[PDB]
Scaffold this motif. Structure first.
Motif, PDB file in Angstrom:
ATOM      1  N   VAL A 161       0.830  -1.203   0.000  1.00  0.00           N
ATOM      2  CA  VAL A 161       0.000   0.000   0.000  1.00  0.00           C
ATOM      3  C   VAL A 161       0.864   1.253   0.000  1.00  0.00           C
ATOM      4  CG1 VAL A 161      -1.665   1.309   1.322  1.00  0.00           C
ATOM      5  CG2 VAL A 161      -2.007  -1.117   1.011  1.00  0.00           C
ATOM      6  N   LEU A 162       1.955   1.239   0.765  1.00  0.00           N
ATOM      7  CA  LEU A 162       2.712   2.466   0.965  1.00  0.00           C
ATOM      8  C   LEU A 162       3.523   2.823  -0.268  1.00  0.00           C
ATOM      9  CD1 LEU A 162       3.905   1.977   4.601  1.00  0.00           C
ATOM     10  CD2 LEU A 162       1.873   3.171   3.751  1.00  0.00           C
ATOM     11  N   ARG A 209       7.226   3.929  -7.478  1.00  0.00           N
ATOM     12  CA  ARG A 209       6.109   3.191  -6.898  1.00  0.00           C
ATOM     13  C   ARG A 209       5.946   1.789  -7.468  1.00  0.00           C
ATOM     14  NH1 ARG A 209       2.880   6.346  -3.746  1.00  0.00           N
ATOM     15  NH2 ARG A 209       3.016   8.622  -3.990  1.00  0.00           N
ATOM     16  N   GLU A 235       2.786   1.878  -3.313  1.00  0.00           N
ATOM     17  CA  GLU A 235       1.889   2.238  -4.393  1.00  0.00           C
ATOM     18  C   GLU A 235       1.119   3.518  -4.099  1.00  0.00           C
ATOM     19  OE1 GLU A 235      -0.308  -1.349  -4.895  1.00  0.00           O
ATOM     20  OE2 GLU A 235       1.166  -2.265  -6.248  1.00  0.00           O
ATOM     21  N   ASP A 236       0.585   3.690  -2.880  1.00  0.00           N
ATOM     22  CA  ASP A 236      -0.388   4.745  -2.652  1.00  0.00           C
ATOM     23  C   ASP A 236      -0.088   5.537  -1.372  1.00  0.00           C
ATOM     24  OD1 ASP A 236      -2.365   4.234  -4.876  1.00  0.00           O
ATOM     25  OD2 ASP A 236      -2.398   2.274  -3.857  1.00  0.00           O
ATOM     26  N   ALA A 237       0.969   6.341  -1.386  1.00  0.00           N
ATOM     27  CA  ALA A 237       1.287   7.064  -0.163  1.00  0.00           C
ATOM     28  C   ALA A 237       2.223   8.206  -0.486  1.00  0.00           C
ATOM     29  CB  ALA A 237       1.911   6.153   0.904  1.00  0.00           C
ATOM     30  N   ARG A 238       2.055   9.293   0.258  1.00  0.00           N
ATOM     31  CA  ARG A 238       2.852  10.462  -0.024  1.00  0.00           C
ATOM     32  C   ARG A 238       4.166  10.234   0.699  1.00  0.00           C
ATOM     33  NH1 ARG A 238      -0.248  15.172  -1.621  1.00  0.00           N
ATOM     34  NH2 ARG A 238      -1.750  14.478  -3.201  1.00  0.00           N
ATOM     35  N   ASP A 239       4.234  10.579   1.976  1.00  0.00           N
ATOM     36  CA  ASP A 239       5.442  10.397   2.755  1.00  0.00           C
ATOM     37  C   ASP A 239       5.162   9.395   3.853  1.00  0.00           C
ATOM     38  OD1 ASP A 239       6.741  12.264   1.234  1.00  0.00           O
ATOM     39  OD2 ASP A 239       6.575  13.858   2.727  1.00  0.00           O
ATOM     40  N   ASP A 254       0.546  11.780   5.003  1.00  0.00           N
ATOM     41  CA  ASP A 254      -0.475  12.479   4.247  1.00  0.00           C
ATOM     42  C   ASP A 254      -0.870  11.624   3.064  1.00  0.00           C
ATOM     43  OD1 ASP A 254      -0.320  14.614   5.953  1.00  0.00           O
ATOM     44  OD2 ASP A 254       0.874  15.844   4.591  1.00  0.00           O
ATOM     45  N   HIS A 297      -0.221  12.611  -7.077  1.00  0.00           N
ATOM     46  CA  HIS A 297      -0.623  11.262  -6.720  1.00  0.00           C
ATOM     47  C   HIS A 297      -1.687  11.262  -5.631  1.00  0.00           C
ATOM     48  CE1 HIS A 297      -0.155   7.002  -7.215  1.00  0.00           C
ATOM     49  NE2 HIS A 297      -0.314   6.890  -5.911  1.00  0.00           N
TER      50      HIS A 297
END
Lengths: 271, 271
Positions: free
Chosen positions: A126-127, A238, A129-133, B133, B113
């Motif tokens: 998840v992180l 990613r 692929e789909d995470a900012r920081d 975030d 993203h």
């Protein structure tokens, strides 16, 4: 005069191919020299693994004489090379901190909820692929290594380190230097003395020293290499497969580099 | 004189219990009045659902006369209330943008993203529990609503909106106002006229209007309520159960509020 070689020896503690002598005598622009110093120093720190990755390490040249090299943290003067390596080491030691385990307690990104990975596998997919920081706590990687990872903006980074110490570096290189003597009688005598003084003690006694006269002056005595970081900024950030690939790369570089430093260390052990 | 009531009517388009008349005549400090205006306006915008949550909406009073209320975005003057509601609407319309669907294309957090949720269930549990975030794309919630969520620092927020239009608001309130007449002969006559002019047209003709003479001057004509946001800053921010709870809360508030506005709208429909 001597600042250039000091810094080069410092860098040499890690796989840092410093060329500062080829540009200081070439009249290179002072800002470009400083820039190169800084990039070298930062890489050096990635290798040493002090868990001080949250700081800005910069390196400058002096304007006066005898021109020395300034080590700065966050634009403040911290140390100078003319202080000898041990002082620089203690300086950095006051900065480092360790948790309940023999690991850095700091974390890279500004403080606040480092990821308690705990268990699980799709935990991080998840992180990536789909995470900012984010940044993970240390992962107790079974392969005799500890690893953690974070991303800042479009940059994804992983570090791996083994808990080490210059003393382990020296034990390895010293035993290896004893084995490389190729003089079984002299070697026998030194091995016999190691029984009471350790490998290093015997090797020092062989070179007319009392307690490592020149040893204390040389960098490799402290802050050996124990960590490495792999980072990428770019589309693949990613991909996740890229992430496993970074991990593999990091382990490979860690092993290769620490073996390389033992090689160079052992080499200087016999001179 | 008239600016206070303008703003109050504006706010009244959403469940905004403005009390500005109870403080403007009380000699309240100008900065506190402005502060309250601003908080009210921001809530109003959460309700309206223009997908402009990425902006700073501020509201000020004027120093000259006739003292008006300034609407600002990111500290720049944007509109004033004396311009009438329709102008303010068009102004805001130039700001809003919609994607391939009839939905806001903007996203809340600085660009970069937004989470392509796609499918999956433990997809987000990772994000609530272990993430700095992020913001999701819109979720096509089956219950006739669209929802998305994001967090900024220690603040976690969810918004829900139904695609609406002041015209649907007015159709509902107008049919309901026709049903509330309680004069079956007059009601019959107006229902018969609705066949050609719509509910609103009939209701306007009943009050000696040609095309809604006072209608255009009143806010409720445009930007009805269609969205709501629930946010929490505080320990429970990562509880996840709290997150489902926020969602439930948001749906409940959306339904309650839009019904409330239809109530108030219908009320003014019969005067």
């Amino acid at each position: 005069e001597d600042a250039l070689r000091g810094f080069d020896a410092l860098m040499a503690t890690a796989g840092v191919e410093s060329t500062i002598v080829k540009h200081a005598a070439s009249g290179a622009d002072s800002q470009t020299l400083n820039d190169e110093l800084t990039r070298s120093l930062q890489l050096a720190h990635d290798r040493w693994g002090l868990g001080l990755l949250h700081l800005r390490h910069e390196a400058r040249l002096d304007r006066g004489e005898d021109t020395d090299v300034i080590l700065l943290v966050d634009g403040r003067e911290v140390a100078r090379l003319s202080q000898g390596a041990a002082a620089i080491s203690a300086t950095y030691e006051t900065m480092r901190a360790q948790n309940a385990d023999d690991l850095s307690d700091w974390g890279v990104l500004p403080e606040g909820h480092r990821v308690t990975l705990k268990a699980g596998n799709n935990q991080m997919r998840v992180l990536v692929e789909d995470a900012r920081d984010f940044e993970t706590h240390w992962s107790s990687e079974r392969g005799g290594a500890f690893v953690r990872t974070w991303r800042q903006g479009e940059t994804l980074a992983v570090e791996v380190h083994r808990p080490a110490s210059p003393g382990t570096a020296l034990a390895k290189a010293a035993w290896k230097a004893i084995m490389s003597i190729k003089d079984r009688n002299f070697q026998r005598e030194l091995m016999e003395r190691s029984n009471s003084v350790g490998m290093l003690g015997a090797l020092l006694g062989a070179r007319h020293k009392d307690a490592g006269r020149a040893l204390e002056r040389l960098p490799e005595a402290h802050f050996a290499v124990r960590s490495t970081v792999v980072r990428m900024t770019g589309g693949a950030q990613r991909e996740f497969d890229q992430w496993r690939s970074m991990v593999r790369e990091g382990l490979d570089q860690l092993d290769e580099l620490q073996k390389t430093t033992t090689r160079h260390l052992t080499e200087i052990l016999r001179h």
